[PDB]
Design a protein around this ligand. Structure first.
Ligand SMILES: Nc1ncnc2c1ncn2[C@@H]1O[C@H](COP(=O)(O)OP(=O)(O)O)[C@@H](O)[C@H]1O
Ligand SMILES: [Mg+2]
Lengths: 52, 54, 53, 161
């Protein structure tokens, strides 16, 4: 009997759930892990190699 | 004569400098590509398992 | 493994739709043509010396 | 006399003033003079604030003049303060303990009076397990972090005691 019950009449466990989800999220990353990641890409460096 | 012909054999060997660099230009562009592949693959996989973890 | 194990509303689909339709930038050379030209120039300087020798 | 207290006070100075995570100092069977010294050099350093309570260090003290029981349990008291700061707040705690040997020594001073056959070098038969159940609580978990600096007295420069 949990129709309106997300967690079956807890009235608690949220005060630590916020901490667990903070820790779990902060150890997986720091950005928003609910959206797709954009990609910036670099190009290797090069120098003058021909005979000076 | 023997000294001069030795120099010619050496001149003919000169080409090894240019292929070496060409090899390094070849491999580097191959590396940065494969890194770009693993980076993109691994990141998107991370967001997936995070949903699985939470 | 990710179709049948995420209860989030269709978010696994658009991540994978964004993936198969992702174009990773293949790096272009921009650096071997100019060493080939230097190679050509060298063989010129080589061959003329072999002629002198 | 080799410099454990000076080194632990320099570590306090550097790290704790560079830290933002509620340090905790536990004086375990040490000199009371050094306790007063540390208290006042922490007040004058701003780390302890007697007004406008933004203090960042909790002090727990049981010194040489205490009975064996107090000197055996004061390390646990300081440990419990640090453990609350780690678990119920997720903060990153510093835990300075000086001296931890006294903890061990305190046990010895009651061992035979509890009716226990002495072990080697006159130490309680329960030395390793007592040290284990105390030290295994001083640890970083997935819920928080505890950096612990413990001054360990080595009797007579033995290191094999
Ligand atoms: N870093 C140091 N610099 C200068 N003198 C020191 C230093 N450390 C120790 N000493 C000297 O050795 C003495 C003993 O220092 P102390 O911290 O009480 O050692 P312990 O804690 O092992 O008994 C000090 O009074 C001091 O004169
Ligand atoms: Mg000392």
């Amino acid at each position: 009997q949990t129709s309106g019950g997300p967690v079956d009449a807890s009235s608690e466990y949220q005060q630590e759930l916020e901490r667990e989800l903070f820790k779990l999220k902060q150890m997986f990353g720091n950005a928003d892990m609910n959206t797709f990641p954009t990609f910036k890409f670099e190009d290797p460096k090069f120098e003058v190699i021909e005979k000076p | 004569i023997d000294t001069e012909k030795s120099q010619q054999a050496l001149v003919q060997k000169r080409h090894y400098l240019f292929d070496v660099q060409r090899n390094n230009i070849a491999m580097a562009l191959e590396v940065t590509y494969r890194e770009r592949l693993y980076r993109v693959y691994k990141e998107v996989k991370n967001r997936l398992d995070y949903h699985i973890s939470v | 493994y990710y179709k049948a194990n995420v209860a989030k509303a269709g978010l696994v689909d658009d991540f994978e739709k964004k993936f198969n339709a992702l174009k990773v930038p293949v790096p272009e050379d921009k650096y071997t043509a100019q060493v080939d030209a230097e190679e050509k120039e060298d063989v010129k300087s080589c061959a003329e010396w072999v002629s002198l020798s | 006399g080799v410099g454990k207290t000076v080194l632990i006070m320099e570590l306090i100075n550097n790290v704790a003033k560079a830290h933002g995570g509620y340090s905790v100092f536990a004086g375990v069977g040490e000199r009371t003079r050094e306790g007063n010294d540390l208290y006042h050099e922490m007040i004058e350093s701003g780390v302890i604030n007697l007004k406008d309570a933004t203090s960042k260090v909790a002090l727990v003290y049981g010194q040489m003049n205490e009975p064996p029981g107090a000197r055996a349990r004061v390390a646990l008291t300081g440990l419990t303060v640090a453990e609350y700061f780690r678990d119920q707040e997720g903060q990153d705690v510093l835990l300075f303990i000086d001296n931890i040997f006294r903890f061990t020594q305190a046990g010895s001073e009651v061992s035979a009076l509890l009716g226990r056959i002495p072990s080697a070098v006159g130490y309680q038969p329960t030395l390793a397990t007592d040290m284990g159940t105390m030290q295994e609580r001083i640890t970083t978990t997935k819920k928080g972090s505890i950096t612990s600096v413990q001054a360990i007295y080595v009797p007579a420069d033995d290191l094999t005691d």
